[PDB]
Coordinates of all heavy atoms in Angstrom, one line a residue:
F1 N 0.9 -1.2 0.0 CA 0.0 0.0 0.0 C 0.9 1.2 0.0 O 0.8 2.1 -0.9 CB -0.9 0.0 1.2 CG -1.7 1.3 1.4 CD1 -2.9 1.6 0.7 CD2 -1.2 2.3 2.2 CE1 -3.5 2.8 0.9 CE2 -1.8 3.5 2.4 CZ -3.0 3.7 1.7
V2 N 1.7 1.4 1.0 CA 2.6 2.6 1.3 C 3.5 2.8 0.0 O 3.6 3.9 -0.4 CB 3.4 2.4 2.5 CG1 4.6 3.5 2.6 CG2 2.6 2.5 3.8
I3 N 4.1 1.7 -0.5 CA 5.0 1.7 -1.7 C 4.2 2.2 -2.9 O 4.8 3.0 -3.7 CB 5.5 0.2 -2.0 CG1 6.7 -0.1 -1.0 CG2 5.9 0.0 -3.4 CD1 7.5 1.1 -0.5
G4 N 2.9 1.9 -3.1 CA 2.1 2.3 -4.2 C 1.8 3.8 -4.1 O 1.9 4.5 -5.1
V5 N 1.4 4.3 -2.9 CA 1.1 5.7 -2.6 C 2.4 6.5 -2.8 O 2.4 7.5 -3.5 CB 0.6 5.9 -1.1 CG1 0.5 7.3 -0.7 CG2 -0.7 5.2 -0.9
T6 N 3.5 6.1 -2.2 CA 4.9 6.7 -2.2 C 5.3 6.7 -3.7 O 5.7 7.8 -4.1 CB 5.8 5.8 -1.4 OG1 5.9 6.5 -0.1 CG2 7.2 5.8 -1.9
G7 N 5.2 5.6 -4.4 CA 5.6 5.5 -5.8 C 4.8 6.4 -6.7 O 5.5 7.1 -7.6
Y8 N 3.5 6.5 -6.5 CA 2.6 7.3 -7.4 C 2.8 8.8 -7.0 O 2.8 9.6 -8.0 CB 1.1 6.9 -7.1 CG 0.2 7.4 -8.2 CD1 0.3 7.1 -9.5 CD2 -0.9 8.2 -7.8 CE1 -0.5 7.6 -10.5 CE2 -1.8 8.7 -8.8 CZ -1.6 8.4 -10.1 OH -2.5 8.8 -11.0
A9 N 2.9 9.2 -5.7 CA 3.3 10.5 -5.3 C 4.5 11.0 -6.0 O 4.5 12.2 -6.4 CB 3.5 10.5 -3.8
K10 N 5.5 10.1 -6.1 CA 6.9 10.4 -6.6 C 6.8 10.5 -8.2 O 7.6 11.3 -8.7 CB 7.9 9.4 -6.1 CG 8.6 9.8 -4.8 CD 9.1 8.6 -4.0 CE 10.6 8.8 -3.7 NZ 10.8 9.7 -2.5
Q11 N 6.0 9.6 -8.8 CA 5.9 9.5 -10.3 C 5.1 10.7 -10.9 O 5.4 10.9 -12.1 CB 5.3 8.1 -10.6 CG 5.3 7.8 -12.1 CD 3.9 7.8 -12.7 OE1 3.0 7.2 -12.2 NE2 3.8 8.5 -13.8
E12 N 4.3 11.3 -10.1 CA 3.5 12.5 -10.5 C 4.1 13.8 -9.8 O 3.5 14.9 -10.0 CB 2.0 12.3 -10.2 CG 1.2 12.1 -11.4 CD 1.4 10.8 -12.2 OE1 1.8 9.8 -11.5 OE2 1.1 10.8 -13.4
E13 N 5.2 13.7 -9.1 CA 5.9 14.8 -8.4 C 4.9 15.6 -7.5 O 4.7 16.8 -7.7 CB 6.5 15.7 -9.5
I14 N 4.3 14.8 -6.6 CA 3.4 15.4 -5.5 C 4.2 15.2 -4.1 O 4.5 14.1 -3.8 CB 2.1 14.7 -5.5 CG1 1.3 14.9 -6.8 CG2 1.2 15.1 -4.3 CD1 0.5 13.7 -7.2
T15 N 4.4 16.3 -3.4 CA 5.0 16.3 -2.0 C 4.0 15.6 -1.1 O 2.9 16.2 -0.8 CB 5.3 17.7 -1.6 OG1 5.8 18.5 -2.7 CG2 6.5 17.7 -0.5
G16 N 4.3 14.4 -0.5 CA 3.5 13.7 0.4 C 4.0 13.9 1.9 O 5.2 13.7 2.1
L17 N 3.1 14.4 2.7 CA 3.3 14.4 4.2 C 2.4 13.4 4.9 O 1.2 13.7 5.1 CB 3.1 15.8 4.8 CG 3.2 15.9 6.3 CD1 4.5 15.5 6.8 CD2 2.8 17.4 6.7
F18 N 2.9 12.2 5.2 CA 2.1 11.1 5.9 C 2.4 11.2 7.4 O 3.5 11.3 7.8 CB 2.5 9.7 5.3 CG 2.5 9.6 3.8 CD1 3.1 8.5 3.2 CD2 1.8 10.5 3.1 CE1 3.0 8.4 1.8 CE2 1.7 10.4 1.7 CZ 2.3 9.3 1.1
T19 N 1.3 11.1 8.2 CA 1.4 11.0 9.7 C 1.3 9.6 10.1 O 0.8 8.7 9.3 CB 0.3 11.9 10.3 OG1 -1.0 11.4 9.8 CG2 0.4 13.3 10.0
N20 N 1.8 9.3 11.3 CA 1.8 7.9 11.9 C 1.9 8.1 13.4 O 2.9 8.8 13.9 CB 2.9 7.0 11.4 CG 3.2 5.8 12.3 OD1 2.6 4.8 12.0 ND2 4.0 5.9 13.3
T21 N 0.9 7.6 14.2 CA 0.9 7.6 15.7 C 1.7 6.5 16.2 O 1.4 5.3 15.9 CB -0.5 7.6 16.2 OG1 -1.3 8.6 15.6 CG2 -0.6 7.7 17.7
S22 N 2.9 6.8 16.8 CA 3.8 5.8 17.4 C 3.1 5.0 18.6 O 2.4 5.7 19.3 CB 5.1 6.4 17.9 OG 4.8 7.5 18.7
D23 N 3.3 3.7 18.6 CA 2.7 2.8 19.6 C 3.7 2.6 20.8 O 3.5 1.7 21.6 CB 2.3 1.5 19.0 CG 3.3 0.9 18.1 OD1 4.5 1.3 18.1 OD2 2.9 -0.1 17.3
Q24 N 4.7 3.5 20.9 CA 5.7 3.5 22.1 C 5.8 5.0 22.5 O 5.6 5.9 21.6 CB 7.0 3.0 21.6 CG 7.1 1.5 21.4 CD 8.5 1.0 21.0 OE1 8.7 0.4 20.0 NE2 9.4 1.3 21.9
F25 N 6.1 5.3 23.8 CA 6.3 6.6 24.3 C 7.6 7.2 23.8 O 7.6 8.4 23.4 CB 6.3 6.6 25.9 CG 6.1 8.0 26.5 CD1 4.9 8.7 26.3 CD2 7.2 8.6 27.2 CE1 4.8 10.0 26.9 CE2 7.0 9.8 27.7 CZ 5.8 10.5 27.6

């Protein structure tokens, strides 16, 4: 999934800012 989003973002020259909530303090 991430590879496809990342690859497509990069292949169309779109700046992607992805968030992720860490499961550790």
Side-chain angles (χ1 to χ4, degrees), residues 1-12 14-25:
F1 170 86
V2 167
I3 281 335
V5 172
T6 267
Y8 194 61
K10 268 155 129 79
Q11 187 249 310
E12 250 68 27
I14 300 146
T15 327
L17 173 61
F18 307 164
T19 57
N20 166 90
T21 307
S22 51
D23 45 12
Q24 291 181 236
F25 194 67

